[PDB]
Design a protein around this ligand. Structure first.
Ligand SMILES: [Mg+2]
Ligand SMILES: [Mg+2]
Ligand SMILES: [Mg+2]
Ligand SMILES: [Mg+2]
Lengths: 320, 320, 323, 323, 321
C-alpha cells in the first residue's frame, strides 16, 4: 500500500453516529476508537482524512474486510471515478474540485466512499471538503436524514458533492462571459493565453464528469444493500443532476471552442481599419509631397494640391 | 424544502378548464382550494398553475394529488433537462418553452411541467405567457375531437402545441441566418461578428434542449401506461416524429452557422488585400519619383519621371 | 385542429390524376380530375399506379384516404411537406415519404418536392405537390411493355418507382460534382468576391442534401430488411439494389462535404500569400527609397550618387536572401 | 430498363479473355476473344482463373452470367462501376467487388478501376474494365509452380488474388506517405502557390482512398467471419491474414487524413509569420527614416546630424524590445 | 509462407534465456539457436528473448520447433501492424509496440515486440537490442516480488506490465513538451515553434494509433483467458487492462489540448502583426503631413502648427491604440 498523492499535511478521523432520537460525534487520531462502529446498529459516518497514512487505511481495511485491491485503489489518486459492487460493501471513487480564480487553474482531491451495513467509510487526502451541509442536517436534526439509514447517508454525501459541481460550473460560466468580452472587446495579450487555459480546464473537467455520470447511473440502475424501492429515487435525483452537469460542460466546451475564431475575426477587422488609415494618409500626402518636391507657382499649386486632396476624400466616400 | 430556483416572481394565477362531450366550464382563481376538488372529476380537467414561485401552492396541489416530494422539487427547479418520469398513478413531464427576441438577438426559456393523472392534467408555468391558446380554442369552441376524448389526449394536445411552437422559433432563427450570411460577406464590421457568435450560442442552448425533448416523446411513444393504448399512441408518435424533424433542422443550422466566421475571415482578408494593393501602387510609384525629385538639394527629368510611372502602371497590368 | 387536413406546402398550381392499370396482356391508362373514377381500381386484380398530383386538394386526399382505409394521421403526414423521408408499415399498406430534388445551376440553389407513396394490395397510390416528376422512364416501360414490369405485380411497381427516384439523385450529384470542380479552381485560381459566396452556398446545399439522403437510406434499409406485402422470395433483391444505391449516394455526399469543407481554408491560404507578396514589394520599395530619399534630403555630389547607388545594391543583393 | 445490362463506366478501349487452368502436375494458359472457348471450364475439375477484361461488352458478361447461372442483379452490379466494395453470398457462388487504384506521381492524381470476382466450385471469374492490373505475381506463382498455389484449389486462388490487390494498397500508401513528407516540408519552408494546390489534391485523394478502404475491410471481415464454399479451418486463416492487412491499411489512412488535415493550418501559420517579419522591416525602416527625412526637410549642422544619429539609436535600442 | 523481414533493424543478433523456479535460477546469452530449443520442454518457466528477427532463419527454426503456424511467423517478421492478440490451441500470440521519445530532436521511434505464451515458455522477439524489461530481469535475478513462485502466464503479465508502465513515463515526457510549447506558441512566436507543434500532433497520432489497440489487446487477455490460470493471474491482467484505459484517456486529453495550439499561435501572431501596423500607421500618419508642409517650401508659426497637429494626432491615438 503506497500513497501516490501529494497531501501529507493532515490526519484526522471524524465519526458521526446518529439515530432518530440522539446523535454522537467526535474526532480522534486513534483508529481503534472507531472500529467498533462497524457493528453499530445505527448509521455511522466515519470520515478518515489523510490517506497518506497507509497503515490506518490497511487497518480499517482489514477490520471491515475490504479486498486489498480496493485498498490500493483508495490510495491511488490518479483514477477515474467509479463504482465497484461487492457482496458486503459498495465502493465508490469521486473527485472533489477547486477553481482557483485569478490564477486560472483547477485543482482536484480524491474522495473514496464505502457503503457497508450501517457505515459509510469515507477517505480524503486532506482537510477541506464539501460535506458540511450534511454535518449540519445531522447535527440539527434537519431534513429526514436522522430518520433514514446508511444508504441515505451515502446519497446525502454524494448529492452534496455533485451539488458542488454546479457551483464550480458557475465560476467557469463567469470566466466564459469575461472572455467572450475580451475576445471581441478587450483585445489583449492575456486573452488568448486565458482562452486556451479555459479549454484545458474544461477538458480536465469533462474528463471527470462523464465518469461521475457513469457512477450514478450504476447506483441508480443496480442497487444491492441500498434499500430498493426506497432510496433509489433520491439516487436518481443525483443521477439526473450529473446528466445536467455533463450537458452543461459540453455546452461550455462548444462555446469556448469558438472563441479564438471570434478573436481572429475581431483582429483581422481591426487590422483592416488600420490599413485603411495608413492608405488614405499615404494616398493623399504622397502625390502632394511629391509635387511640392518637384521644386528643387504658388497659389495655383496650393489650389491643385487642395483639389486633388478633395477628389480623394470624396472617393474614400466609396469604401472607407 | 421547496425552493424556486427560477427568476419569475411577478405573476400568479390558476386557470381551470373542465370539459366533456356535452358541456364546458372554465374559470380563473388565485385560491388553490377551489381547484383541488377537480382531482376527482370524472371528466378531463386542465388545471394550469402559473407562478410556481409560490412554492406553497405547489406543495398543496402536490400533497392533495399525492405527488412524491422529489417530483415537487423537480417542478420548482428550472435548470433541468426535459424529461419524463413514470409513476403508478401519474406521468410527470418537464418541457421548455422558448422565446426569440429578434433584433436584439437573445433567446429566453420558460419551464413548463406537466402531470397526467386519472382525469387531470396539472400544468405548472413560471410566468404568464404560453403557447397553448389553440388548445383553449378547441375546447372552448368544441372543435376537433378534443372534447370527445380523455385526459391523455389532452396531454398530447398540449405537448403538440408546444412542439409546433419550436417550428415557429426555428423559422425565426432561419431568418437571422439569411441575414447574417449576407452581412458576413457583404458588410465588414464589428457587430456582424458579435451577432454570429450570439447565434451560435443560441443554437447550442437550443440543441441542448431539443435532443432531450426528442427523448421525452420517444418514451411516451414507446412505453405507455395510462395513455390509452392502441388509441392515443399514434398521436404521440406524430409529435415524436416532429421532434425528430426539429432535431434535424437544428443540426442543419449548427453546421451552416459554424462556417460563417470562416467566411467572414476570408471576406475580410481579401478586402484588406485590396487595400494593400492601392497603398503599394501609390508607394511604388511616388517613392522613386519623390526620390529623384529630391536628389536636387528639367523636362528631361519630368519625362523620365512620367515614363517610369507608366512602366509601373503597365506592370500593375500584370496582377492588380 | 390537428385532425383537419391542411396542406402546409406552397404548390397550388396543378391538379390531375393519372392512372396506369397494366397486366401481362393489356394496359389501360387515363387522366381525370374526378376522384371517383379511380377509386374502383382499389380492387383491381392487376397492378394499378394511381398518381395524384396536387395535394393542396385536401378533399381528394381525404376521399382516397377513407376509401382505401388509410389512418388519418397518415393523411396528415402526406399533406405535411416538411418532414424526413420515412416508411411506416401497417396491416394492409406500406406508407413511404420521399423527397424529389432540383438543382438550378447558375443560380446555385436547389429546391425539393415531396412525394408520398402507398403500396396496397394491387395499387400504388402516389401523391405529388405539383406537375413534374422523375418517373417517366417507368411510364415508358409500362407503355412499351419493356423490361419485365408488366409481368410482375405492384410491389415491383413500388420498387420501380423508388429506383427511378434514387437514380435521379445520381444525376443531381453529378451536377454538384461539377460546381465543386469549378470552385476548386476559383478558390485557388480566380481569388475574388463571388467565390466565397458560392463556396458557402455549396456547403449549404450539401447540408440540405445530406439531411435527406441519410433518411432515404434508412427508408430503403427498412424495405430491404423487413418486408410484409412485398413478395418475399421475389422482389427483395431489387429493393436491395436500391438500398445499396442509397449507400453509395450517402457515401458520395460525405465525400463532397469533406472536400468542400476545406475550400475556404484553401482560399484563405491562397489569399494570405498574395497579401504577403504585396507586402514584399512595398517593403523593398520602401526599404531602398527611404534612406536614399533621406540622404538626398539632408541637403538644404558623385560621391553621394555613388554611395546612393551602392547601398541600393547591397539591399537588392540582400533581397536575394528572402524575396 | 434496369434489367437490360448497361456499362456505366468509361473504358471501352479493350477486350480480352485470359484463362489459367492449373493443377498440381501441369498448367495451361491462353487468351481468346471468343467467350464460348472458356465456358467449358465451368466444369473443370481443377482450379481455373478466367479473367475477362473489357466489361463494356455487356453481351459477353450476360453470356458467362447465364452459363455459370448468376443472378441478373449480380450482373448489373458487375457493370456498374460506381459502387462500394462488397461481398454477396449465394448458394453456389460468392460475389465480390473491389477497386484497384493507380497513383500517378508527379502529376498528383489517383485513378481507380473496378474489379469484380466470382468464386464458384472450381473457378474464379474475374471482370476488369481495361487491360492493366496487379495480379501478375499470382500469374508468376502459377506459371513457375511457386508457393503452394498449385497444390491448393479455387478458394485459395480467390485469396491469392485479393491478397495481391490488398498488398498493392500498401505500395500505394507508401507513395502517399512520401508526398506527405515532401509537403510537410514545403508547407513550412516554401511560401508558394503550388504547395496549397498540392495540399488540397492530397486531401482529396485521401478521401477517395478512405472512401474505399473502410468498405474493403468490411468485405474481408465477411469472408473471414462467415465462409460457405471456402474450405473451412483450411483457407480461412489466409483470409484472416488479409483481413488483418485491411485493418492496418484502414488505420494508416486515418493516420494520414489527420496529419494532412493540419497542413494548411501549418502553412497559414508559417505564412502569417513571414508576413509579420516583412512588416517589422518595413516598419523599422519607416519609423527611423521618416522623422529623420522630416527634420532634414524642415530646411525649406553637425548638431542636427548628431540629433539625427542619436534618435536613430534610441529607436534601434527600442526595437530591442520587440523586433 | 516465405519469411521476409520488412523492418529496418539488422544491427543486432542475440538470444537470452532466463529459466527460473521457486528455488533456482539460470540465465545465459547465446548465438546458437539450438542451445535454447530444449527449454521448450522445461518444467519451469523460461523467458527466451530473441533479439534480431532480421534473422528469418532463426525465427523459422524456433517456429517449427515450438510448432507455430507459419502465418504467425509472417506476422512476427512484419513490423507494420496493429497490436493484437491471437489465441491458438497450444499458444497465445501477442504483438506490441515499444516506444522511445528522443527529446530535443522531437521524434519518437517504435520497435515491435511479439510474444508467445506456451506451456512453460514465453518466446519474445525483438528487432534490436534495447527494451523495457530490465526490471523484470532484476525481480527474477534477485528473487523479488512473487515472480519466481508463479508460472509462465504470470511472466507474460510481468513483461506486458513492464511495457505498459513505460507508456506512463513516455506520457510524462510528452506532457512536458506540451507545457513548453504552450509557452512558445504564445510567448516566443517563431518558425521552429510551428514545426514543433506539428511534430507533436504527428507523435500524438502515432501514439493514439497504438494505444487504443493496446487497450483492446489487454481487454481480450482480461476477458476470456485460455492457458492463463484463471481466477489466479487474471486480476493482474486486469490491473494492466485498467492502466491502458488510463493511458488511452490521457492521450485523448493531449490530443485535444494540442489540437488548439496553431489556432493560439495564429491568433498570437495576427495580433502582433496588428501592433506592428499600428506603429507604422502612427509614424506615417504624423510624419507625412508634417514632411508635406515642411516641403511646400519649394517660421516658428509653422513649427508651432507642425507641433500642434502632431499633438492632435497623438491625443487621437488615445481613442484606439
Ligand atoms: Mg531646396
Ligand atoms: Mg398541430
Ligand atoms: Mg480552423
Ligand atoms: Mg502538466
Amino acid at each position: 500500500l503506497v500513497y501516490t498523492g501529494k497531501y501529507r499535511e493532515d490526519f484526522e478521523i471524524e465519526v458521526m453516529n446518529y439515530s432518530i432520537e440522539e446523535f454522537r460525534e467526535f474526532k480522534t487520531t486513534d483508529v481503534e476508537s472507531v472500529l467498533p462502529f462497524r457493528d453499530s446498529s445505527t448509521p455511522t459516518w466515519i470520515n478518515i482524512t489523510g490517506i497518506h497514512r497507509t497503515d490506518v487505511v490497511q487497518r480499517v481495511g482489514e477490520f471491515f474486510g475490504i479486498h486489498p485491491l480496493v485498498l490500493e485503489k483508495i490510495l491511488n489518486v490518479h483514477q477515474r471515478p467509479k463504482v465497484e459492487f461487492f457482496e458486503n460493501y459498495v465502493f465508490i471513487v469521486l473527485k472533489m474540485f477547486t477553481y482557483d480564480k485569478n490564477l486560472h487553474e483547477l485543482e482536484s482531491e480524491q474522495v473514496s466512499l464505502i457503503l457497508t451495513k450501517n457505515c459509510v467509510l469515507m477517505f480524503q487526502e486532506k482537510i477541506g471538503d464539501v460535506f458540511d451541509p450534511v454535518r449540519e442536517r445531522i447535527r440539527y436534526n434537519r431534513g429526514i436524514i436522522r430518520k433514514k439509514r446508511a444508504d441515505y447517508l451515502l446519497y446525502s454525501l454524494i448529492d452534496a458533492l455533485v451539488d458542488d459541481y454546479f457551483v464550480l460550473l458557475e465560476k467557469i460560466d463567469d470566466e466564459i462571459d469575461v472572455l467572450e468580452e475580451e475576445v471581441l472587446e478587450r483585445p489583449e495579450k492575456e486573452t488568448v493565453q486565458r482562452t486556451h487555459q479555459l479549454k484545458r480546464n474544461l477538458v480536465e473537467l469533462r474528463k471527470t464528469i462523464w465518469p461521475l455520470r457513469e457512477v450514478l447511473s450504476s447506483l441508480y440502475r443496480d442497487v444491492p444493500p441500498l434499500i430498493e424501492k426506497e432510496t433509489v429515487p433520491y439516487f436518481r435525483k443525483v443521477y439526473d443532476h450529473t446528466i445536467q452537469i455533463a450537458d452543461t460542460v459540453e455546452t461550455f466546451r462548444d462555446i469556448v471552442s469558438g472563441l479564438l475564431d471570434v478573436y481572429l475575426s475581431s483582429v483581422s477587422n481591426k487590422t483592416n481599419e488600420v490599413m485603411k488609415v495608413l492608405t488614405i494618409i499615404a494616398t493623399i500626402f504622397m502625390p502632394l509631397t511629391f509635387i511640392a518636391g518637384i521644386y528643387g507657382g504658388y497659389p495655383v499649386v496650393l489650389a491643385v494640391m487642395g483639389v486633388i486632396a478633395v477628389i480623394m476624400v470624396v472617393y474614400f466616400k466609396k469604401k472607407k
